[PDB]
Amino acid sequence: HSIRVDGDIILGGLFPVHAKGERGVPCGELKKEKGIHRLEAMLYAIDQINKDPDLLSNITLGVRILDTCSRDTYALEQSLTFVQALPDKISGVIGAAASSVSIMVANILRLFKIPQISYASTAPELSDNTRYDFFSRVVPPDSYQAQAMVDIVTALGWNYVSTLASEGNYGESGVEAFTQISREIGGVCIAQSQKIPREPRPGEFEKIIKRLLETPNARAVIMFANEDDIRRILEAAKKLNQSGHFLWIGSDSWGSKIAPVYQQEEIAEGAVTILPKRASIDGFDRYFRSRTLANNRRNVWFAEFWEENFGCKLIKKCTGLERIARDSSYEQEGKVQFVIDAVYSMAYALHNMHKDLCPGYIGLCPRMSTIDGKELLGYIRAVNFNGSAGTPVTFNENGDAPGRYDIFQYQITNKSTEYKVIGHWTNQLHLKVEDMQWATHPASVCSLPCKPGERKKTVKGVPCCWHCERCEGYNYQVDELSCELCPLDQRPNMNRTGCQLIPIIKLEWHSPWAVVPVFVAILGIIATTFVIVTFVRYNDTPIVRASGRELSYVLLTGIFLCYSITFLMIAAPDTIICSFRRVFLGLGMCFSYAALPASQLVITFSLISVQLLGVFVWFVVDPPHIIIDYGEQRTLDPEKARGVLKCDISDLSLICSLGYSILLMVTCTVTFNEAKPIGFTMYTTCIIWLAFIPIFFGTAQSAEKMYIQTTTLTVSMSLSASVSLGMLYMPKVYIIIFHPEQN
Amino acid sequence: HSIRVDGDIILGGLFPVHAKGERGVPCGELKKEKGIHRLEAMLYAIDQINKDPDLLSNITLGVRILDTCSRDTYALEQSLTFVQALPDKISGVIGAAASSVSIMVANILRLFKIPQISYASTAPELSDNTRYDFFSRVVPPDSYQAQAMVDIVTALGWNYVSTLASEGNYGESGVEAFTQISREIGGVCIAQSQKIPREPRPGEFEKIIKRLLETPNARAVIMFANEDDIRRILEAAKKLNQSGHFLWIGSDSWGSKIAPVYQQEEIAEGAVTILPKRASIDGFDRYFRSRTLANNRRNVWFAEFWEENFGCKLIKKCTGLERIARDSSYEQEGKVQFVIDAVYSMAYALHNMHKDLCPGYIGLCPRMSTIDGKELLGYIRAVNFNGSAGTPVTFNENGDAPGRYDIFQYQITNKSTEYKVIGHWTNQLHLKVEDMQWATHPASVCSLPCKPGERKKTVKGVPCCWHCERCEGYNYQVDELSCELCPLDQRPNMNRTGCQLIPIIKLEWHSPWAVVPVFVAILGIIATTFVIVTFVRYNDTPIVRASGRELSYVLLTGIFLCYSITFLMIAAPDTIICSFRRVFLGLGMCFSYAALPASQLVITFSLISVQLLGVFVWFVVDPPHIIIDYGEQRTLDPEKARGVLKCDISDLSLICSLGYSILLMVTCTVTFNEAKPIGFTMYTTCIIWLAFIPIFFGTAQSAEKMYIQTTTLTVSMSLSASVSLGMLYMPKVYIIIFHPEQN
Ligand SMILES: CC[C@H](C)c1ccc(NC(=O)CSCc2ccc(Br)cc2)cc1
Ligand SMILES: CC[C@H](C)c1ccc(NC(=O)CSCc2ccc(Br)cc2)cc1
Ligand SMILES: N[C@H](C(=O)O)c1ccc(C(=O)O)c(C(=O)O)c1
């Protein structure tokens, strides 16, 4: 149950020939690929070194190879089996495969000063020169793998991921390194971090999947887990109908293995894996294919391998004549090159030490009776040679190896499925995205990029997630972070970012609510013009003399001024046209309702002069201007919020002149003719103005206010002036024009 | 550099006499309390066992005590020093103090079947019977401590905490157990989880404090860290001015130590710590105080302890006459009882094994030449005795001890500061909150309890945090989770949870906008009554006959009906009073504006009958009712949103009768008297109704609509009827009443 080959310098070996026992038993079944192939590779390397005449001339290399059974306690016992004389002496040990096994064996071997070189251990914790003084490895540590994973995650644009870690030293340390690098660099945020137990209860993987489903926006999972755990996680995901939700990124524990995805292709399609660079060795293939029982009795586990390989027992009966790669499928294990490289590194270190310490001698000099551990380690750390794959093998000052990785993606096209190479990582990422075949490019982001107008509220803690909401219609967008109200006296732009020009309305000759007043004003002007023109040629007429030669003219001018008011008050509010128009308002009203030889002079000029200076007083003290009447007319919808242009003569400033003129109109109008017509005129005017209070105040405002008020005022004043002029002169005109003899 | 005392059965020992070296050196300074006291306690226990005649009669117990220097590699070397013959044989080993040291020593000792009993290791990982077969401890594991911490956290009401873990096996495993128990029980949520490095760079602790300050609502920190880390964290917190923000909950690594809080009382006041139950031993105190150099040469580290204790070197020169507890302060280490209990447990196991295997013999029987490890472990697991403090010592089926803890709180009152006992934990919490002195009770909660009306939105993932916001004023509160709009035809209650009764207005005899119509109606009724009463007694009067004996009466009745309309239309909208009132509207209007021997019969009845059947048609086809006119009058503020009561006669349904009556009023009124008065009446009525269109439609609505429309209608109709009646009969009345001879 142990392989011994004699020689002058004896190296050790630890390989996982058997797997962990099911329960209460140390060793279980046989690992054909992981156990037998690697020890056969070590034996082949030793034979090549012994046969080589230019390396370790006349010096033989022996081996003492034992088994670990994938358990650290068994390997601890075997490591104690190594160091017993401290008689043959072990000069070096080819390290174990699992991280825990290597850690415990290195803990033991540091006391007795025995250099150790591993081929499959990647734990970062072994890079500490203050705790593991005599440990080296030909595979890169997991710090480089975590950095590469971060670079891949940030290269595809993802910034929201979850992590899965298998219990132990490997997965937990890898996930911790990834988390620390992510926190230091910044840019990607970790949502959840799970922990697959060593011995899970039934239904554990479904529970893990359901917990991962507590964050639908984290579709990318970083996995540092064993192949059995990967298979069971994929089985649970398939069972829960998530064939397309998750995106997988695996470590070297996934690699290019087929067992975890044997009949679960759809749930694992598009998974990204990372492996150390490696190739196949044809010499090892020929050596292994040349092995038979009659010539490979050096291996003590070879009969069990024969039985478990060809399916017989020596059921079917072994004929002792089968050959590998013919009666069964054959394929190299991926980690043969590393074992051969470790063995050759030890050989080269011994060669250099012999060259320095024992010069010009054939064989082994007496000074070299006992190999010195510390000097041997120093020589190990400074080797430089080309390995079995044509690639250099070198070490750092800590004993690690440079990080050189290849990247694979699982892809399904028609019926052929295979891990396809897409890029590499040699101190810097090189990823060809044009050859990535998912299920265009997917997405794993916490928050979508928002539209233009919002306020971005970064959540406390994680910078990756933001909740963006669109502010009200009364504000604009200052930036992606805040909103502000430009419309203090304006309106916002349609994009809720700018500030639009304010709509405004007016009464510029528009047809609605403005054509009736001018229509009646034209007729009134024509009638008054006809009356006055008829009177002009007949100033000597006896009825004209009875009415007064100039008594009529002033009145006709007054009502003509009233018509001028009723007409040119609808054009536009400005500082040129409607400015100073209210003095004409009052002038026309006072004439038409007051003027009704020198006596005429005084009673026509005195009162109009006093009222003229009065109106002049408040035209000076209260000058006109243009107003923009947004004010309280702030409609909630800006598109429905239109301003208006009006004269600076206020709402109650146009009416002030009327009251004086109203009191002047009441009775100040001064058996004979023309008396009863004046009485009828006064009665008609009184009935006209009785209803004026609701007429002149529509008490509605809204948007009709200017239109309703202007139309009511113009119509009422025009009608009153029309009746006043009419029920006194039209008749006399008819007598003058139609019947000439009645005079 | 090692203590050897001979005997028949030899036990081992591992104690941390020295501390870790600063750099590149295995052992540093001397630990007077942690190293010397515990080994002296073990020696005292061995001497007591040997002197006791009822325990291990005629059998001597020896010891082989070594040093660990607080480093697991040194202890590994010493453990290898134990097992070398596998000649004196080690029957058992008193375990180490640190978790890692015990783990490595137990990994070594499981191979050679040597039972191990520890006194200060609390790591949960050592409770696995499939990995550490020969390990037992007299202190409880950290699972019980984590459960107690969870119970304490949930007992004070806190539900939002942060965790600090020192690098290693102890702190990380404790924090992991706490997190797992928290997740399983549910109710408390972990915000952040930090990691204090073994060798921190300058400024690390300030960075940790600043990271902890990224969550102001998590004021409680669970700490599993070393005393130096505690001191440095407190120093950083004091430097950053957080004297009162954080609340501390520490494990047994804090305990009742004074060094971490030596001159940092204010930053650490109110910290809660947990310790295993223990007491002091007076026998050990007497034994230690009795030691001098002349009689304690068995201890090989005693001279160094003397020098480092009394401050001299044998600077000041040692006189060789000092005594402990007089020339220096003396105090027992807390973990003497556990060491004595472990030694006595091993002794009792050996006693029981001897009693069973070698019966009725004095000394050691030949069958007992070699102690069997597995049977010795089986005997160890089933011991039951009272220890050195009067408390039972027992083991589980895993080798642990029951969880029994005491709880301390650091308190500052005036000048005296001391850890005060507040409660305990023996399979269930017992906490006296009335004696807790903070800085009333503080709080550490993610979200405050919200007021009544909101919608609680539980965040995805953690159930502990909710963001609650108050919905609009148009909705109520269905529950703490959602809002809904009760006011589809109602208003909400003031608490935004219920549904309030809708305010409503009316025109029930209220003084504004309703007293002028009745005031003029009373006068009109009085005038009409006086006129008709005057005519009644004078039906034979010649001017009455000229006016028509019954021609006047129908008209006077018609205008009286108009006054009845103008009056009783302001009372209330119902299905009794304002119902069917519009037939009287039309009846009065048609009389007053149409009736103006058998000829009178036909021209009074025919037209009123046809219009009466007409109005009856739409009173039947369009029956009246009561309306509530919320409709579009939905004011945004419910307090300002009041309804109104109106008659079901629509806005355009009260006017329909008028048009027929208007056309009947136009000219249908049918050299002699009374002709010119009727002409004047017609003219006055025409001028009255000319302005009616804006009068009868105030085009304002708002809230005045009913009032303005009703007042305008009643006033206009009353005034028209008043003028129509007046400008024809008042005169005749004056002739009849005042001047009697004019007839
Ligand atoms: C007699 C009082 C005054 C002159 C008067 C006369 C008639 C009207 N209105 C009409 O005849 C209806 S057409 C013009 C109009 C349309 C809509 C609105 Br609101 C107001 C006036 C307004 C005031
Ligand atoms: C056709 C004219 C009609 C008879 C008339 C005349 C005057 C009034 N109203 C007034 O003189 C003012 S008292 C009623 C009133 C109060 C406030 C508002 Br605002 C409008 C009307 C109403 C109808
Ligand atoms: N990198 C980890 C470690 O160091 O723990 C590792 C080492 C060795 C093997 C192996 O025996 O093939 C595997 C594997 O099963 O893929 C994983």
Ligand SMILES: N[C@H](C(=O)O)c1ccc(C(=O)O)c(C(=O)O)c1
């Ligand atoms: N419970 C932890 C552990 O198991 O590691 C522990 C063990 C021993 C000691 C000690 O030497 O006194 C301390 C301490 O420093 O207070 C803490």
